[PDB]
Every structure is written in structure tokens, then in C-alpha cells.
Symmetry: D2
Subunit: 343 residues, 4 copies
């Protein structure tokens, strides 16, 4: 039984507080399913979307959220998942399937893609319309609150770690132990890497140590590049999940020669890439954008096997503005997940 | 018959004019050979050295030159080339052979390497001591003046094009059609790529068209990214050989999604890497530093087969200051090569 | 619009090894995602002969209209078709794929276990009309030469992907073994990819074709041992592509490689060949099967042809002559490719 | 301090029993060191050598052994390790350092290589001459008996696993849980792989399970391809360490589409490669031969961190003939290591 209207956190304009509104519940069309949202992780991208930080703007008005997980309650024609299935609705909400990028295994680069909680309404709501062809597939007995961050934080850093090409037994630095970074530490350990964690607050490094990091460095107390070269001779790879350009520049510093640094974090603007050093050391800098459907299933398998556990605190849908305030202040221990079915 | 003394172009202090001096000729030690220099290409790296543009500084005083080619006239013990061999003395003058990087095929990254015309004296002289294990091997009937740029300009851009991973049938942009860039156009065509050439003067683009470029862009008159995306939907790869940071940023602009841009040019400082675009488009930015001994042989084979031919103008060793002046003001058509033999 | 007849002529095999017969076959209306293509030409692939003879362990449907180098014009569209009436298209081996499995999502739709194969599991281009999945057809330029372009739809895309699968770089040596339908365009793709090319076959006329199409070395394996000759001449191959229909060519393909060489396999004779273990291990030999190409491989392969870098050697035949065509194919008497001129 | 003569296990003719002989101890020449052997692992390659199974024959007479580990007791000129260093002397005893293969990271393919205990005398002796540039470097407090198999069994399967390109979270099959296979199980788990183990005797699969295998298959009782496809849909990769051609054929059977099977085992003869299946499934078959000096250091690091521990039983040098007879009958639990210092 599906209600006619639902509660959803809606933003009207950039930088405005979100407001809980009553929205009509839509019927799914072709390929679509209607998902009853059990939980939805809060990604920093939702904050970038609310604030309009990016040159590519979201739609307005907007229901954010692309870590939404729940149960399929209605299917349109040609749906690829059935009622009762547990699914997640991620950033890569849909792709065309017939372009250069989709056909070659790079559907994350499809120029016709739609983005959940950005170009179409997302999981900050009691129900969400999803394209059944691109949802994450969850086990029926999944813990919705704990699995939610895998739909973006998890798949993103997992794909990012593959993009660094760091091998088992090599060193990777994770810079920014937030929502993305704290699961990045765990994926990297499950991939056989030694892990150095970089942040700017000691409690973030305490989280990394709990989750398996072999080294921790507070960039405000210690220059990361000098410290990691001194300790172990520099990193084979690095993954930048931080929201500050200076972390990107320091990420270059921590690499040994032929290192590869993958970029997830999306602050506005640029960082200075030192040319001489990048050339003489054969540094590779590579942007990495969420993950394909195959990346997503692989990332979920790591969580299903207990190798990756997101650190989660539940919040109510109505408190989303307080969640964004804590996020702006760096006060979140891992991820906040909205418990939408719980209250 | 080897002289005790020789003429050499020597720099004494940064930014100072070079002077032709009489310097001693050394006898080669273990693994070393003494090479009689027939020609030596003038690389912009030589200018960065004499000006001290880089944070890692050269020795001072310094004989520059790492595009030197000539004939072996004396061998130290355990030399790996013989008297009469035609050889080249490149930037990767020597490497340790036993580190992580040398063992895995990346001897260009050896942290114990020595660099010709930078950390050791180079080819701006009548004779040069070389490590016989790292010289380029030339055919006995080589044209020394024409082959000289392959020893750095050639091997560098050839390896750089490999580092872009651009495939046959894909588009590469070459930025800066100078010493490196004008042979990069030719390697790229020989590797099956379509080639877009970018520079800031029309005569550089005329050279590129002459050498096979399919598109040309004067970045001063036309935004490279806008034009190449409009014309062909953007580049699969780019190779930056230019000496200005903005060329690196415009190099990012011209790429399509999943493009890879390889960096050769070595201007001082940094360029602004746009984070959002690099992430959402899966852009790969990769530094590329000369080439291994295997890269160098491959680069020479392309030249020997007539697929790549450097555009060369000779100058006398005493004219090196005039050469650098033309280089600073961008008036060299391809490469200058010092005709040290005659 | 186009006046589509209720029946058409098609070359049909009723049982394995039997001669094909021109039959009056009903013309089908396209369903969802489907289009009806009026066939202008269809290349004859040796796979069509393996299909008619039932050579393979995975059997075709029977009865069967062969042909997966069919090219023509769309004359009818089903619902949700992805090409429109009047478009020039080709109907390849990879007739359709699921689009949502592990292989489809990761760039390997040629490995889709739910794929259908043109002229094998579904009726193909040996007919005046063919039903196609509009999502997987090759896209041709409106002014294409249908007879000349047809082999790119399988011979061309296959060897192009195969050459990529060898990982042979510009300036390196590749050997092409079997200068037939696939091999004679493989020579040209390899040259356009900057490779030096050695051609191997067992009849001098095939090596004459390879030389005329750009091969740098030729060897008749009956005249000269290929491995010894190519190691003597240039020190062995960095890569090899086996397009031959005889297992001994696969064994000799191993011989021609230098250390760290990669040999990609296209040819599909029944049975196996002997892989020498000691040699393969000590030399780090890589043997890699290669199966047609993705939609992206196909567009790339067609781009080489459109630019004049690859030109199939083609002789026209009538649909009614298909049995003589197969006879010539069995005796090794085809100079490159035979293409059925169906429109004329 | 160093004797003029030593005991060594020597084979005089193919298939003959080895005899313990008194042989002179040699002085190390240039680049060479003399190693006092603490232990030496027994590799099936040693048995292939003694029996002359391979078309490339060893030197005769021969001291086998290329898992020898010990202490440097004397250095020739230009030695790269010092007296007192703990080292191992592997299959890749020396390489040229200047060919196509050495320069590109593939020194295991060097056509000028010498092979320890095959083309030069090896570790089945109280002392062994080694090339100081190619020895494995061991920690001073190493357990010599337990580390010895890493010098060939360990580095070989570690490199072989890299050659399969199996990723963390994917399935690899290890075929043959012997000297190589039982450490292959451990490297694969440390590389994040799920592991299926295949052999022809239940005790070999018990060893695999104790060392971390997730699935085991007795190929004599159960078809591996049928079982592994039914259980998990086939393997992303396979590593063949077995000594019988049928294991190679069955290794093909267990792969899913786009699987890669790497070959370590070196039985004489060939195996039947099914052409249709290899093509339609895009199967990659890849030979893999020991590992480079970098591979070797990486493999030792896994052992030093406790992620890989060889299953070892000590034997005396005089027992080598019964060790080979146990090897022929498949009765070795992992590796036998000659305890030479004891
Ligand atoms: N590329 C992708 O596919 C993708 C996907 C999801 C999120 N993101 C982006 O990743 C970024 C992080 O997202 P999140 O949800 O993890 O955010 P978050 O707010 O949970 O955590 C950010 C972390 O960065 C740390 N940090 C700040 N300055 C730092 C510095 N100088 N050095 C090191 N660490 C520093 C903070 O202490 C904090 O731990 C955002 O920009 C988001 O938009 C990208
Ligand atoms: N990485 C390596 O291995 C390596 C090897 C050799 C040289 N280099 C470096 O490469 C650079 C080029 O060397 P060269 O000898 O070819 O120099 P060069 O002086 O011959 O040519 C430089 C070229 O850049 C062009 N250029 C300048 N501003 C430009 C802009 N905004 N956009 C595009 N093109 C622009 C100039 O017109 C000129 O054609 C130097 O920094 C040199 O040190 C690096
Ligand atoms: N893997 C794929 O994707 C794919 C695609 C298309 C075709 N094929 C297969 O490729 C094979 C060839 O097809 P085709 O259409 O080119 O056939 P074809 O009959 O036109 O040519 C076969 C060629 O092999 C030569 N040959 C025969 N014995 C030889 C030997 N011992 N050594 C070297 N060459 C020898 C013949 O002389 C002839 O030139 C067939 O088995 C076909 O089914 C595979
Ligand atoms: N390629 C290399 O670099 C390299 C290095 C070292 C050794 N090797 C070779 O690897 C092989 C094995 O060496 P080892 O020391 O481990 O030998 P081993 O005798 O210790 O082990 C061989 C194992 O194979 C098993 N086996 C036999 N028949 C089998 C079958 N049908 N299926 C599966 N398993 C089967 C046996 O039960 C035994 O467990 C030898 O041929 C040796 O020469 C190669
Ligand atoms: Cl799940
Ligand atoms: Cl030359
Ligand atoms: Cl076309
Ligand atoms: Cl050790
Ligand atoms: Zn997100
Ligand atoms: Zn798309
Ligand atoms: Zn080195
Ligand atoms: Zn230079
Ligand atoms: Zn599929
Ligand atoms: Zn075909
Ligand atoms: Zn061994
Ligand atoms: Zn060598």
C-alpha cells in the first residue's frame, strides 16, 4: 500500500536551508521502479548540490540523496527488479548504454547520464523513483543503515583505489578520512595495500587507526610528504577524498617516483600541479568518478563479506540541516545516514 | 692522436653569456669512452640549465649538451662500445642498474642517475666522456647533424606519446611545435594518430602542417579547447612540449572524457589543474621524462626508416649565445644543431 | 516508404554438409528493437562454411540462412528501433547482446553469454531481407560501396580487434597466418597500426596478395619453416594473429614469436593444437583467443576503411552461386573475399 | 676460516643416483661472492635436471639447487654484498643487464642468463659461488630453513599470480599443491583472491585448506571444470604448478570467459589447447618464469611479514636420493629443505 503523498527534504535555491515538504508520490514509468526508502546516506556532494558549489548546476527544486537504500514497492513496464527487492539508488542513476563510454566499460563517463539527487530527485525522501537498470542490488537481509554509504562512498573509493593501480604489498595514502576516506582505508586493506591516513584533525586519524591504517599523519602538525618519505620512502599511490585543494598539493608530495594519485574530492577551483616534479618523477594524476554497475556490485561484495564496514550514525530526515552544519564543521565521525523508515 | 686540450662552450654563472674556453680532455675510466663530438643538438633544457630555472641545479661551471653525437676515439676498461663506433650521449647519461626503477624497466626514474650536460659535462665541446653502457648506438653512415635531435627531442616525445596511450586512429594534440614538438608530430603520425598542433605563432603551425599535422591552432588567436572540441569532439591524448604553464591548462581543455595528457615541457613553477573537470571527465595527467635505452633505440629506428626527420639548422659552437637568444624569442625552426666537426 | 514483398529469395541449408538451396522464404515484420534490412550485399565468411557443415561443438540452428557480413538499407522499423528507414547498416556476428551482464558492462559484450549470432543462431544475410537488432548493427555512411564494405562487418572488425589483442606496438613485428578473407585485411590493419608485417600461408598466390597489400615479409610454410625463417630474418615476432583454418598454423605461430611475444587466435578449425609447455613458460609466451569485436571495435574498424587505409579484396557472386563459392573456399581458391551481390 | 674442499651432492649422468663428493671450494672472482650454505630447498626443477627431462640440458656433472640460502663468507672484486650478509642464490643466477629484456623489466627472459644449479653449480653443497648482483637479500635474523623455498617456489608463484591479473575479490585456481602450489595458495589470499585448490590426492588438498583455500577439488574423483563452474561460475584466473599435461587442460576448463591461466609447471611435452573454446571465451594462456630481482624482493617481503610461510621438512644432504624418490611418488608435504649447516 503506497500513500499518495510523502515527506521529503527539498531545497529551493542555492545556499538555502532544506525544508521538509509534502510531495506527491509518483507512479513508475518504463524501466522505472518506486523504492520505499529505508535509509539514505548523506554525501558531501549533497552539500555541494545544496550550495551550488559546482559549475554544472543541479535542478531546482531538488530532493538530494544518492545513497538511498530500500525496498521496491512498485514496478513500471520493463522493470529489471521486482517488488520486494532490496536496492540502492546511486549517483550514476542512469546512462545511455549505447555511447562510446558505455560500450567500452566506462558508463560513469556517459554524457547522457542522469545523477540521483542532482539532476533527478533522490533519496532524502520516503519514496524515490529509480531506473531499475542502474540500481545497486542488495541482499534481502541487508542492514539498510550500515550499507547505505556503499552506494556512493564505498563504490567511489573502491573504484578510486583501482584507478591508483596500487598493488598488494604497496603503500597507498588516503587523504581525508571522512565519509569516503574511512571506508577507503578498509577497501585498501582488503586489497592488500599498506595504508597511510592523512587528515587535519586527530580524531579523524583515530578513526583511520581503528579501521586498519598503518600510519597516520596530521598535516597541520607534520608535513605529510616529508614524513611519509622519511618513514617508508613515499607512497605508490594516493587517493584524495578531502574537500580542500591544499590536500591535493600535499598528495603530490607523498608519492614516490612513478606514483599515481587518484582524485575523488570535489572542492571548487584548482590546485597547483608542480610541473618539474611531476615530469621528472613520472607522477600520474587521475580523476576518478564514482563507479560502474560492475564496480558497485564488487564494492557491495566487500561489505557483504565483512571486509568493509561503514561507520554510521543515524539522523532523522527533519534534522538534515543540522547534519549539513556538522559536515561543514568536520564534526561527523565517518558518515551520517538518514533513518527514513525509522521515524 | 687525442689532444690534451679542447674547445668547449662553458657557462660560469646563471644567466651569464657562455664563453668558448680551452678545457682539458680527460682519459676515460672504467665503463667510460671518450667521444669525438661531430654534432650536438641544442635543447631548451640547456637553456633552463644555463639560466638555473630548475630547483635541482646543475653543476657550475658547466658544459651543456645532451644531444651530442660522434665517434668513439678511446675506451676505458670494461667499455661496452669500441673505437670507431658512432654513438650519442643523451640526458640519461648513466643509471645504477640495480634499483627498483632500473630493474622494472623505468631506468629513467633512477635516483642515482647522472644527466649529460647538467650533472656532468656534455656535448657543447669537441670531446665528451660518456658512460658506454647508456649511449645511443648509431649506424656507421649516420648523418650526425640530422640525427642529433633524436638523442633527446626524439626519444622524449616518442616515449611521451606512448605515455598518452593514444591508439592508432585516435586524436592527439601536440602543444608547442618546437624542437620536441616538430618531431612529436612525426612520431604521432607514424604511430597511426591524427595530430592537432598547438602553438602561439603561425610559422610554428606551418612547420607542423608541413610535417603532417591534420589540424593547427594558434592559441593566441583561438581557444584550443573550444576549437578542437568543435572540430572533432576533443582529443584522446595530448603531449605538452611548450614552455609556458598556460599551455598545460589549455592541454587539459582539449581532451575528451578519459583523455590522457602527457607532460614533457619543463617551465619553472606550476599550472592550475581544474579539479572538478579532471574528476568528472576521468582525465589522466602524466609526467614523462626522456626515455630508457630501449625507448632510445626504438626512437632511432623510426628515424633510420625515414619516418621521422628532424628539421635542423647548423650553428657554430662559438655562436651558442646567438642560438639561445633565438631560442628565447622563439625564432628557431625546429632545432639548432651545433656543427662541431666542421 | 518501401514496398516490402511477402516472400524473398534466400540461400537455406536444411542439414549439415548439404548443398544450400535458394528458397522462397516469408518476409517477417520487425518487432521491438528490430528493423528489416534490404540486403545489398553479404560477404561470405568461412564461419558460414563451418555453420553449414556443423563443424563446431556449439551448433547453429537448422534450417539456416547463413551470413553475418550483410549490408543494406533499413526498410522497416519495429517499436523502439535505434536506426531509421533509409539508414545504411550492416548485420554482424554479434547480432545482439544482453547489455546488463558482467561482460556487457565492462566493455566485453563480445563475451555476452546471452548473445545471438547472425547467420548462426538467427537467420542472416544470405537473403534479400534480414531482420536485425537495431541496437547492434554497424552504422554505414549513406554513400558506402556496399560490395566493398561488407567484409569489414566481420573479417575487418575481427582482425582489427585481434591485432589490438596481440598488444603489438607501432614499430614492432606481427605475423599474420592465413592470408584469406580475414588475413588479407589483417595485413592492412597491421600496417595502418604502424606494425611491420610478416605474412604466412601455404600457397604462393596468398603471399602474393599479402605483398600487394603491404606485407614486409612473406613465407610459404611448405617451402620454409616459418619459425626458423622469421627468427633468422628479424629475430622473431612481437605478435602473431592466426587467421588460418588448420591447427598446424597455430603450432607454427608459436614458433615465430620472440620471447614475451603474444599470439592472438581468430581461426576456428575444429579440435585442438599442441601447446609446448617448456617453451611457452621459459619464453613468457601469451596465447589469447579473440572473438569478433564490440560495437566500438566495429565503428573503429569501419573508420579505417572509410579513410582508405583498409580495402577488402572482393569478387562478386550471385546468391544462386553460393555452393560454388563454398567449393572455391574449401579448395583455397578465393582471392581475399567473395561478396554476394544480392541487390544486383 | 674457509676450507679448501667441501661436500656436495653431485649428479654425474642423467637419471643416476646422486653421490656425495668432496669437491674443491673456489675463490670468488669479479662480482662473485662465496656463500656458506645454511639450507637449500629442493625444487622439482632439480629433479627435471637430474633426469634430463628438458630439451635445454643442464651442465654435467652438476651440483643442483637454486633455493640455497646462507651467509657471505668471501667477496671477489666489485661484489655487491658484504661478508656476513644473509643471501639466497636463485634460478636467475645472473643476467646481462643490457639487452631488450633486461632493460624493460623482463630480466627473467634474458637470453644470456645463467641458472643456478643447472648451468652453474648450485646450493646442494656446503658452499656456493654466487653472482652478488642477483642474490636475494635476507634479513640477518632469517630462519634459513623456512625462508629457502621463497627463493624459487615463492617468487615464482607470486610472479605467476601477478601474471594471471586476478584482482582482489576474484577467484583463482591453484593446480598442484606441492612445493610451489602450497605457497601459491598463501600469496593468492594475501593478494585478496578467493582460492580454489586442485590436486590428485586428498592430503594435498588438506594442506591447501589448512593454508587458506576456500574450495578444494580432487581431480581424480571430480571434474574440476564442472565443479568450479557449478560452485562459483568459474575462475577469473588459474595458476598451473602441476607436473602433468592433463592438469593444464583442466586448468583451461575451470576458467570463466576472459579468464587468464598462467603456467609455472614444466613437465616435458605439450598439452592440448582447445581452439574453439579459447577463441569464443577470450581465454589468455601465459607462461611465467620465476621472477625478477624486484619480484624476488616483493615475495620475500610477504614472508617477512608473516603472510606466507612455507611448509618445510628438513633433510640431510646425504638423503637427497630418498627426497627425489618421495617427490616422484608425491609424498612431500609442501617442501623438503636440505639442512646443510646442521
Ligand atoms: N569523485 C566522486 O565520485 C565522489 C563521490 C562522492 C563524493 N565525492 C566528493 O568527495 C569529497 C568528500 O566527500 P565526503 O562525503 O567524504 O566528505 P566528508 O565531509 O565526510 O569528509 C571530508 C574530509 O576531508 C578532511 N580534510 C579537510 N581538509 C583536509 C586537508 N587539508 N587534508 C586532508 N584531509 C582534509 C576532513 O577533515 C574530512 O575528514 C566531497 O568533495 C565530495 O563531493 C566525490
Ligand atoms: N621531459 C623531458 O624528458 C624533456 C626532454 C627534452 C626537453 N624537455 C623540455 O621541453 C621543453 C621544450 O623544449 P624544446 O627544446 O622543444 O624547446 P623549444 O624552445 O624549441 O620550443 C618551445 C615551443 O613552445 C612553444 N610555445 C610557447 N608558448 C606556448 C603556448 N602557450 N602554447 C603552445 N606552445 C607554446 C614555442 O612557440 C616553441 O615552439 C623545455 O622545457 C625543455 O626543457 C623535456
Ligand atoms: N574469431 C573470430 O572472431 C572469427 C571471425 C571470423 C572468422 N573466423 C574464423 O577464421 C577462419 C578463417 O576465416 P576466413 O574467412 O579468412 O577463411 P578463408 O577460407 O577465406 O582463409 C583461410 C586461409 O588460411 C590459409 N591457410 C590454410 N592452411 C594454412 C596453414 N597451414 N598455415 C597458414 N595459412 C593456412 C588458407 O590458405 C587461406 O588463405 C575460419 O575458421 C573462420 O571461422 C573467426
Ligand atoms: N616456471 C617456473 O618459474 C618454475 C619454478 C619452479 C618450479 N617450476 C616447475 O613447477 C613444477 C612443480 O614444482 P614443485 O617443486 O612444486 O613440484 P612438487 O613435486 O613439489 O609438486 C607437484 C604437485 O603437482 C601435483 N599434481 C600432479 N598431477 C596433478 C594433476 N593432474 N592435477 C593437479 N595437480 C597435480 C602433485 O600431486 C604435487 O602436489 C615442476 O615442473 C617444476 O620444474 C617452474
Ligand atoms: Cl548487500
Ligand atoms: Cl642511426
Ligand atoms: Cl562506412
Ligand atoms: Cl628475509
Ligand atoms: Zn556521493
Ligand atoms: Zn552512454
Ligand atoms: Zn637505478
Ligand atoms: Zn633535452
Ligand atoms: Zn550481456
Ligand atoms: Zn565471420
Ligand atoms: Zn626452482
Ligand atoms: Zn639481458
Amino acid at each position: 500500500m503506497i500513500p499518495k503523498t510523502m515527506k521529503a527534504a527539498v531545497v529551493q535555491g542555492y545556499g538555502e536551508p532544506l525544508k521538509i515538504q509534502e510531495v506527491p508520490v509518483r507512479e513508475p514509468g518504463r524501466y522505472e521502479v518506486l523504492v520505499k526508502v529505508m535509509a539514505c546516506g548523506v554525501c558531501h556532494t549533497d552539500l555541494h548540490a545544496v550550495d551550488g558549489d559546482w559549475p554544472a548546476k543541479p535542478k531546482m527544486p531538488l530532493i538530494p540523496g544518492h545513497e538511498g537504500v530500500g525496498i521496491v514497492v512498485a514496478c513500471g513496464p520493463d522493470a529489471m527488479v521486482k517488488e520486494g527487492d532490496a536496492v540502492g539508488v546511486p549517483w550514476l542513476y542512469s546512462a545511455c548504454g549505447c555511447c562510446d563510454y558505455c560500450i567500452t566499460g566506462w558508463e560513469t563517463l556517459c554524457e547522457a547520464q542522469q545523477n540521483g539527487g542532482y539532476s533527478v530527485d533522490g533519496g532524502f525522501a520516503e519514496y524515490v523513483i529509480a531506473d531499475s537498470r542502474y540500481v545497486g542490488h542488495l541482499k534481502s537481509n541487508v542492514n539498510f543503515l550500515e550499507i547505505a554509504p556503499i552506494l556512493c562512498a564505498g563504490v567511489t573509493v573502491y573504484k578510486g583505489l583501482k584507478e591508483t593501480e596500487t598493488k598488494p604489498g604497496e603503500w597507498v595514502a588516503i587523504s581525508g578520512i571522512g565519509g569516503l576516506g574511512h571506508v577507503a582505508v578498509q577497501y585498501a586493506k582488503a586489497m592488500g595495500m599498506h595504508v597511510a591516513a592523512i587528515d587535519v584533525a586527530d580524531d579523524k586519524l583515530e578513526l583511520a587507526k581503528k579501521l586498519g591504517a598503518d600510519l597516520t599523519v596530521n598535516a597541520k602538525t607534520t608535513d605529510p610528504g616529508t614524513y611519509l618519505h622519511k618513514e617508508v620512502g613515499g607512497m605508490h599511490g594516493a587517493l584524495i577524498t578531502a574537500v580542500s585543494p591544499i590536500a591535493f598539493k600535499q598528495g603530490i608530495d607523498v608519492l614516490r617516483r612513478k606514483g599515481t594519485i587518484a582524485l575523488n574530492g570535489l572542492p571548487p577551483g584548482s590546485f597547483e600541479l608542480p610541473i618539474f616534479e611531476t615530469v621528472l618523477k613520472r607522477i600520474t594524476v587521475r580523476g576518478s568518478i564514482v563507479g560502474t554497475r560492475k564496480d558497485l556490485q564488487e564494492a557491495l561484495d566487500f561489505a557483504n563479506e565483512g571486509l568493509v564496514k561503514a561507520t554510521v550514525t543515524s539522523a532523522k530526515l527533519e534534522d538534515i540541516n543540522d547534519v549539513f552544519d556538522k559536515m561543514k564543521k568536520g564534526q561527523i565521525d565517518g558518515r551520517i545516514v538518514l533513518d527514513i523508515a525509522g521515524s
